[PDB]
Curated annotation (Swiss-Prot), chain B:
Sequence similarity: Belongs to the DIM1 family.
Subcellular location, principal: nucleus
Listed InterPro entries: Dim1, Thioredoxin-like_sf
Biological role stated in the UniProt entry: Plays a role in pre-mRNA splicing as component of the U5 snRNP and U4/U6-U5 tri-snRNP complexes that are involved in spliceosome assembly, and as component of the precatalytic spliceosome (spliceosome B complex).
GO cellular component entries: cytosol; nucleoplasm; nucleus; spliceosomal complex; U2-type precatalytic spliceosome; U4/U6 x U5 tri-snRNP complex; U5 snRNP
SUPFAM superfamilies (UniProt xref): Thioredoxin-like
Protein name: Thioredoxin-like protein 4A
Organism: Homo sapiens
Residues recorded with modification Phosphoserine: S131
Subunit structure, as described in the record: Component of the precatalytic spliceosome (spliceosome B complex). Component of the U5 snRNP complex. Component of the U4/U6-U5 tri-snRNP complex. The U4/U6-U5 tri-snRNP complex is a building block of the precatalytic spliceosome (spliceosome B complex). The U4/U6-U5 tri-snRNP complex is composed of the U4, U6 and U5 snRNAs and at least PRPF3, PRPF4, PRPF6, PRPF8, PRPF31, SNRNP200, TXNL4A, SNRNP40, SNRPB, SNRPD1, SNRPD2, SNRPD3, SNRPE, SNRPF, SNRPG, DDX23, CD2BP2, PPIH, SNU13, EFTUD2, SART1 and USP39, plus LSM2, LSM3, LSM4, LSM5, LSM6, LSM7 and LSM8. Directly interacts with CD2BP2.
Swiss-Prot record, chain D:
Domains: entry comment: The MPN (JAB/Mov34) domain mediates interaction with TSSC4 and SNRNP200. Has structural similarity with deubiquitinating enzymes, but lacks the residues that would bind the catalytic metal ion.
Full protein stretch here: 56 to 146 of 2335
Protein name per the record: Pre-mRNA-processing-splicing factor 8
Function, in words: Plays a role in pre-mRNA splicing as core component of precatalytic, catalytic and postcatalytic spliceosomal complexes, both of the predominant U2-type spliceosome and the minor U12-type spliceosome. Functions as a scaffold that mediates the ordered assembly of spliceosomal proteins and snRNAs. Required for the assembly of the U4/U6-U5 tri-snRNP complex, a building block of the spliceosome. Functions as a scaffold that positions spliceosomal U2, U5 and U6 snRNAs at splice sites on pre-mRNA substrates, so that splicing can occur. Interacts with both the 5' and the 3' splice site.
Tissue-level expression: Widely expressed.
Cellular location(s): Nucleus; Nucleus speckle
From Swiss-Prot, chain E:
Coverage span on the entire protein: 96 to 149 of 941
Transmembrane regions: none
Tissue specificity remark: Widely expressed.
Organism: Homo sapiens (Human)
Function of the molecule: Involved in pre-mRNA splicing as component of the U4/U6-U5 tri-snRNP complex, one of the building blocks of the spliceosome. Enhances dihydrotestosterone-induced transactivation activity of AR, as well as dexamethasone-induced transactivation activity of NR3C1, but does not affect estrogen-induced transactivation.
PTM entry text: Phosphorylated by PRP4K during spliceosome assembly.
Superkingdom as given in the UniProt entry: Eukaryota
Subunit structure: Identified in the spliceosome B complex. Identified in the spliceosome C complex. Associates with the U5 snRNP particle. Component of the U4/U6-U5 tri-snRNP complex composed of the U4, U6 and U5 snRNAs and at least PRPF3, PRPF4, PRPF6, PRPF8, PRPF31, SNRNP200, TXNL4A, SNRNP40, DDX23, CD2BP2, PPIH, SNU13, EFTUD2, SART1 and USP39, LSm proteins LSm2-8 and Sm proteins. Interacts with ARAF. Interacts with AR and NR3C1, but not ESR1, independently of the presence of hormones. Interacts with USH1G.
Name by which UniProt lists this protein: Pre-mRNA-processing factor 6
Swiss-Prot record, chain F:
Protein name, as recorded: Probable ATP-dependent RNA helicase DDX23
Species this protein is from: Homo sapiens
Role this protein plays: Involved in pre-mRNA splicing and its phosphorylated form (by SRPK2) is required for spliceosomal B complex formation. Independently of its spliceosome formation function, required for the suppression of incorrect R-loops formed during transcription; R-loops are composed of a DNA:RNA hybrid and the associated non-template single-stranded DNA.
Family recorded in the similarity comment: Belongs to the DEAD box helicase family. DDX23/PRP28 subfamily.
Post-translational modification: In vitro phosphorylated by CLK1 and U1 snRNP-associated protein kinase. Phosphorylated by SRPK2 and this phosphorylation is required for its association with the tri-snRNP (U4/U6-U5 tri-small nuclear ribonucleoproteins) and subsequent spliceosomal B complex formation. May be phosphorylated by SRPK2 on Ser residues in the SR domain; the phosphorylation is required for the removal of inappropriate R-loops during transcription.
Encoding gene, per UniProt annotation: DDX23
RNA sequence: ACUCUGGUUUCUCUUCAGAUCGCAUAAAUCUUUCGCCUUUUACUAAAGAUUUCCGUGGAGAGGAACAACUCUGAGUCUU
RNA sequence: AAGGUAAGUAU
């Protein structure tokens, strides 16, 4: 395979490794949902399109 | 900061700009607690007495006096503005904003030079004065 | 498509805060050494 | 009570009503209108993730639309069964 | 007065969305402030005894 | 040349503009060792294939070692079943290729809608 | 071979999240080390700590579909 | 994205 696709392979691996390394467990939260508080107010309507 | 005279409402700023007829009114819009404003105000206090003959320095709290926030775009942490005979004076600082000085200057000589240039140009009738120093770069090396 | 969606999830807060503080009624806007003295 | 699903013609009529700024019929409803425009990126993010796949002609999605036509979100998360999704993309 | 009652709706919506971790991040910053002040006390407290002696 | 590459490696061990492309100098898959250059690709028992790459081409790039092993170890009886399966699959693929052929091999009257739009799109 | 055993789905709210919340993966700020350096606003790329965002699990609560029978184990379970 | 606003009288 040519040089550019190989370098693409190493760079994709680099980004994958960086993501897997600089990963911290998600922080606890109270689960506030958007698009649920929009329709609570009298400003948004629901349909299907 | 706490030594320079303070203007407490928009009418007081109006009168301060109107009152002086032979001196440039230097007004610092900002907050006393802002670190950039503290540096600017301590430089102004350092040069407050030296420029007594041709400049008067006032301090305006934009939170307390938001009267000129819309027109003068007083939204930077610190702002220094010059007026002469009830006429805002612009300075070709090289920063792209000629209407005001919106950063803290360390050297007290540069502010004296800016005030002196503003006074000369305004007494000559100009509305724009080219600053002796070009501030397009902080000259950090 | 998924790569640009992953960019989108990160860039959404920036655009949201830049807008909401722009088309609102009220607009909002060397200090280390000259600090302690 | 609970908010039901409005007919799809409601949003079409509202959007056709909201033509341009030149029309003088709507000039005072500004805070209600442009207060929700800051959520435009979500509208960008919600539809792009709900993009129809190559094996679908029409993809009906639930829509949460502003009462003034200012904004419309695709109120749906593209949940898929992973072996089914992978097999579909292999096909 | 249909505008001042509509800004409050969006403001409360923004506050509700911030309510996800508002208590869990304003509590951690409290402990960080206490830890920082343990080593570097406030300037006013560094003169509290002298100010008292005036 | 490559003999001096090993010695050079031993000595080295012991002694504005937007770039959409990735520079070829960033490539790491450069080796002097013949073992690490011409690696032995996984045969997967002659019955597994790398993803993405089409199976038809992968079959003809196979090492043929496992095919020879099968045709050697297989007895006649079990060889007939594999021959029948190969013939059936070959006939199915031949029918698929016959149906999926270019418009140059079809008459105008027997053209289908897909072939018609393929010809039009040319 | 018996009587009682009470569902599942779905819409919201309030909290706790250890765990690949996530078999996927962005952005911002700050602090250091750098590479551009020429000034912010953007950056080069590693580290550390944070924030936001796209999503998630568990539990509790409140409505709806549900309409409830019974699943089901508990048992003297029977010839 | 910028650091590229001549200023001045007159309606």
């Amino acid at each position: 395979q040519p040089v550019k696709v190989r370098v693409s392979y190493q760079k994709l691996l680099k980004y994958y490794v960086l993501n897997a390394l600089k990963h911290r467990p998600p922080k606890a939260q109270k689960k506030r949902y958007l698009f649920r508080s929009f329709k609570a107010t009298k400003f948004f309507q629901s349909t299907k399109l | 900061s706490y030594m320079l005279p303070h203007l407490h409402n928009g009418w007081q700023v109006d009168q301060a700009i109107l009152s002086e007829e032979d001196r440039v009114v230097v007004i610092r819009f900002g907050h006393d607690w802002d670190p950039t404003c503290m540096k600017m105000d301590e430089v102004l206090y350092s040069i407050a007495e030296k420029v007594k003959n041709f400049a008067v320095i006032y301090l305006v709290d934009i939170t307390e006096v938001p009267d000129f926030n819309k027109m003068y775009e007083l939204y930077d942490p610190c702002t220094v503005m010059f007026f002469f005979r009830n006429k805002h004076i612009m300075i070709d600082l090289g920063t792209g904003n000629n209407n005001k000085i919106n950063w803290a200057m360390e050297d007290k000589q540069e502010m004296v030079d800016i005030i002196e240039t503003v006074y000369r140009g305004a007494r000559k009738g100009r509305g724009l004065v080219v600053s002796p120093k070009d501030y397009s770069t902080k000259y950090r090396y | 498509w998924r790569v640009w969606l992953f960019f989108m999830r990160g860039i959404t807060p920036l655009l949201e805060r830049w807008l909401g503080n722009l088309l609102a009624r009220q607009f909002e806007g060397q200090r280390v050494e000259s600090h302690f003295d | 009570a609970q908010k039901e699903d409005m007919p799809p013609e409601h949003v079409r009529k509202i959007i056709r009503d909201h033509g341009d700024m030149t029309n003088r019929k709507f000039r005072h409803d500004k805070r209600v209108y442009l207060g929700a425009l800051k959520y435009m990126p979500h509208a960008v993010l919600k539809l792009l993730e709900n993009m129809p796949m190559p094996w679908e002609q029409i993809r009906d999605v639930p829509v949460l639309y502003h009462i003034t036509g200012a904004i419309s979100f695709v109120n749906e998360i593209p949940w898929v069964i992973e072996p089914v999704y992978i097999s579909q993309w292999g096909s | 007065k249909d505008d001042e009652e509509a800004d409050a709706i969006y403001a409360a919506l923004d506050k509700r969305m911030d309510e996800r971790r508002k208590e869990r991040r304003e509590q951690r910053e409290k402990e960080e402030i206490e830890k920082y002040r343990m080593e570097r006390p406030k300037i006013q407290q560094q003169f509290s005894d002298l100010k008292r002696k005036l | 040349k490559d003999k001096s590459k090993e010695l050079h490696a031993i000595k080295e061990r012991y002694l504005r503009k937007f770039v959409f492309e990735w520079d070829a100098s960033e490539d790491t898959s450069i080796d002097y060792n013949p073992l690490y250059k011409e690696r032995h690709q996984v045969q997967l028992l002659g019955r597994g294939f790398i993803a993405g790459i089409d199976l038809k081409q992968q079959k003809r790039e196979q090492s043929r070692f496992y095919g020879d092993l099968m045709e050697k170890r297989r007895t006649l009886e079990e060889k007939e079943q594999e021959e029948a399966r190969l013939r059936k699959l070959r006939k199915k693929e031949a029918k698929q290729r016959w149906d999926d052929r270019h418009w140059s091999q079809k008459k105008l009257d027997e053209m289908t809608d897909r072939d018609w739009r393929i010809f039009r799109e040319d």
